[PDB]
Amino acid sequence: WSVRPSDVKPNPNKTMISLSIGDPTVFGNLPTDPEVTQAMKDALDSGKYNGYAPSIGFLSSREEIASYYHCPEAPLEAKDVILTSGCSQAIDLCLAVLANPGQNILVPRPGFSLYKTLAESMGIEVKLYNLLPEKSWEIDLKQLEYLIDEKTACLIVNNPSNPCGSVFSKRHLQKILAVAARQCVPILADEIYGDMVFSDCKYEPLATLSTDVPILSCGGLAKRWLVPGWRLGWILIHDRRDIFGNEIRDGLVKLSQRILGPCTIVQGALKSILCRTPGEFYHNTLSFLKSNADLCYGALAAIPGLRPVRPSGAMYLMVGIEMEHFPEFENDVEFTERLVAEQSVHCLPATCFEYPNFIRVVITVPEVMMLEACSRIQEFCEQHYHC
Amino acid sequence: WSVRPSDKVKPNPNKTMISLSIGDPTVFGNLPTDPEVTQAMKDALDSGKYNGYAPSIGFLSSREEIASYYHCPEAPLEAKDVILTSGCSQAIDLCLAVLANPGQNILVPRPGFSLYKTLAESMGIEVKLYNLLPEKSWEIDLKQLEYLIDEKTACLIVNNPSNPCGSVFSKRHLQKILAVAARQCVPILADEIYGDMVFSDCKYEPLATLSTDVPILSCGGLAKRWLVPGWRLGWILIHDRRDIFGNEIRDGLVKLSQRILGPCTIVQGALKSILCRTPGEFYHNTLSFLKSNADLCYGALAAIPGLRPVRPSGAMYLMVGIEMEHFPEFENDVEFTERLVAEQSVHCLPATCFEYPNFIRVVITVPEVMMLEACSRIQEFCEQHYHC
Numbered sequence A: 001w002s003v004r005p006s007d008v009k010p011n012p013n014k015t016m017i018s019l020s021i022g023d024p025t026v027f028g029n030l031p032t033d034p035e036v037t038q039a040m041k042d043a044l045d046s047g048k049y050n051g052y053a054p055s056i057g058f059l060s061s062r063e064e065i066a067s068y069y070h071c072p073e074a075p076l077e078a079k080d081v082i083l084t085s086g087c088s089q090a091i092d093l094c095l096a097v098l099a100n101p102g103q104n105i106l107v108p109r110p111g112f113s114l115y116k117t118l119a120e121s122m123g124i125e126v127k128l129y130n131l132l133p134e135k136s137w138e139i140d141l142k143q144l145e146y147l148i149d150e151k152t153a154c155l156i157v158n159n160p161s162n163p164c165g166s167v168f169s170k171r172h173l174q175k176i177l178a179v180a181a182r183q184c185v186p187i188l189a190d191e192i193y194g195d196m197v198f199s200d201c202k203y204e205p206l207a208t209l210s211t212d213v214p215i216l217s218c219g220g221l222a223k224r225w226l227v228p229g230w231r232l233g234w235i236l237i238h239d240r241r242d243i244f245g246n247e248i249r250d251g252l253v254k255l256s257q258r259i260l261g262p263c264t265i266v267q268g269a270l271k272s273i274l275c276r277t278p279g280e281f282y283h284n285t286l287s288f289l290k291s292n293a294d295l296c297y298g299a300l301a302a303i304p305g306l307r308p309v310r311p312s313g314a315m316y317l318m319v320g321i322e323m324e325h326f327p328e329f330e331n332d333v334e335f336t337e338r339l340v341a342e343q344s345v346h347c348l349p350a351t352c353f354e355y356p357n358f359i360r361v362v363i364t365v366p367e368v369m370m371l372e373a374c375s376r377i378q379e380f381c382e383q384h385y386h387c
Numbered sequence B: 001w002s003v004r005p006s007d008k009v010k011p012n013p014n015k016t017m018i019s020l021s022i023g024d025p026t027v028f029g030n031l032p033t034d035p036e037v038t039q040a041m042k043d044a045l046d047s048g049k050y051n052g053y054a055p056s057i058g059f060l061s062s063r064e065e066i067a068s069y070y071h072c073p074e075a076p077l078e079a080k081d082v083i084l085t086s087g088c089s090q091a092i093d094l095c096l097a098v099l100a101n102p103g104q105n106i107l108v109p110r111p112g113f114s115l116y117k118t119l120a121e122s123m124g125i126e127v128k129l130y131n132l133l134p135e136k137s138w139e140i141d142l143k144q145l146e147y148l149i150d151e152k153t154a155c156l157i158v159n160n161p162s163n164p165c166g167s168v169f170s171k172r173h174l175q176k177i178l179a180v181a182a183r184q185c186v187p188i189l190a191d192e193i194y195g196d197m198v199f200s201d202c203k204y205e206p207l208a209t210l211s212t213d214v215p216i217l218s219c220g221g222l223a224k225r226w227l228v229p230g231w232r233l234g235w236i237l238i239h240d241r242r243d244i245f246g247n248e249i250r251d252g253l254v255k256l257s258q259r260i261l262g263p264c265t266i267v268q269g270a271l272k273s274i275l276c277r278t279p280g281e282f283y284h285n286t287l288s289f290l291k292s293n294a295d296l297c298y299g300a301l302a303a304i305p306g307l308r309p310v311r312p313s314g315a316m317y318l319m320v321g322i323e324m325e326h327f328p329e330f331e332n333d334v335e336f337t338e339r340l341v342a343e344q345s346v347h348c349l350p351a352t353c354f355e356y357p358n359f360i361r362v363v364i365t366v367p368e369v370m371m372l373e374a375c376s377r378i379q380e381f382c383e384q385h386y387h388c
């Protein structure tokens, strides 16, 4: 017999407030629209969506996604859509089809930690490119271009960003594409937060700005429809000039037949989710995020020693910590641990996203909980701040 | 730019096609799931409590329910021994991932469900094949089984009841299989998606209720027994013995699960009512339909000269031997099934698909009148091509 695997307590009299949980559902203040719920119930009542779909998804479901995201600058037919078990599987399929062991991918820093996790598990090297906190978390284009070599199979771009809450300008997206053009590298666009911008930027999908650069774009229901548990995502294949060709398409189909795709009830409900979910839902969501973002940025900005970077989208912001003014702490991990011990407020240390001396805060908590949290954080910082 | 990827017959146009080859038992509408299954999902939806992220291995309460439903003292399960998956397919995948590295091997049955080969060989695990015996109700060749396992053999796959064979191993034979792996010290991945779907004079014992010293990862799910394969919910039941798996494998399973992040939370939330409220008569009526159709199909094709079916006790299929010497025109089961489509518009799956030539698989889940028609067409076809 030799069976082996393959290769700080919170302050007890202050009630815990977590600003670290990356799930918009958790406090019940962001339920999905009733129409979303109804579409699932309708799909269930039909009895049509209980049998096996093809691995890449029902044709009609793929057709509905294609026609929901198609535009002349980035056309999509059903054949350009693969439905997946959440965006995470979408990202995983794209990486597994583009990159072999030994090849590298370029990942943002700070960045959603899934990319590094999926890639390093599959033997894929990860090169980290910086985002600039003083330029609205824009990509350091000079470093990005430098980092690309002959082993680079793929470039990961996440816009709008978790953990940054940034929304890249049109110009900056164009400048990102140009780098990818010159170095002849495809892009995996993680656009799970697409259309979730609450600022006076507008959202452009990356593919709608590309002419020469082939893009695999990943999205899903998780965040915009506030049903992350439902496990439905998708890959939008945005080929240019036959660079992906039939081969990447076929490879995606093959790799998809492994797990067999997402829950068929969610695929059946997708038509009515996209067609009947009112504009008010998306608007009320974005209005709540923005005013929570104003309260948070505003409260944290007033605190000596913190440097919040205002978000324009998604469901977070990053806060810089001026460590010189907090001598007793060595990094963001110590800071956040002490904050829990003294104030029972959990913020996520950005060392989790490969970016020390920052923290991420979610802006999806009820506003009265955001208010209380920031207040507690002001007291903590006041009590530990040194000039 | 070097973006490279990583490392037919027309049916008789006069006769309406009858497919006996489709793995989906629901495709014809004669096997809907129970209303309580549907209601449980609707209730889960109305609650608004199952829309957020669950742990990758599944909600504690959902896992508790599965643990509770399959527990018995001879094979105990608590919530920690359960991992909810995106269909039984992923369950089987995760089990093979955690148990075996690129270079190691696994024992797979023949005829065997083809997923075991596709999964293993795609992540670099080499597959070795062990025989099932048609003349002994598709029982495992025990002598060959105990041979062929190297010291590199990471795992033994047992599928019972069987797709494609429709067999249900006896308590005796299951103990005999356990006895092999124990004294040869190799763990069992038990695919029991068809568990409790037995319709003849054999009881269903889950492989682990009979283990004592052989540690088993059992894979099941809602797909077949609750007739909702598309819903993508399965599970792993860890039946460790003597801490042979230990925390390492448990933790290996847990890490790997955090990759995909598990099955739809609505199905997880509905699991309690699905297991608790689905009536006994639903399972019974399903098995009554299956038995009737098995009798009709078995009887029909036995009567046909040149065909030797092996009668099933469970699951949703049976295998039919083709007496190739009485059909000179044909070489393979592939040609036989191709001409059958050409002449009679009946599609049977040639068993070459399952690495077992000169046999065919037939689904016993098509409506009875469709089975009747298909069988009489097959009779005529065989009569028209039979020699001697």
Ligand SMILES: *Cc1c(COP(=O)(O)O)cnc(C)c1O
Residues within 6 Å of the ligand: A085, A086, A087, A088, A089, A112, A158, A161, A162, A190, A192, A220, A221, A222, A223, A228, A231, A232, A233, B261
């Ligand atoms: C949530 C998230 C995902 C994963 O989404 P799921 O559909 O739940 O798998 C991918 N990328 C980013 C940036 C996310 O925040």
Ligand SMILES: *Cc1c(COP(=O)(O)O)cnc(C)c1O
Residues within 6 Å of the ligand: A260, B086, B087, B088, B089, B090, B113, B159, B162, B163, B191, B193, B221, B222, B223, B224, B229, B232, B233, B234
């Ligand atoms: C159908 C089947 C499976 C796959 O089950 P899913 O839950 O649909 O993934 C696994 N094993 C056997 C023997 C099957 O017939």
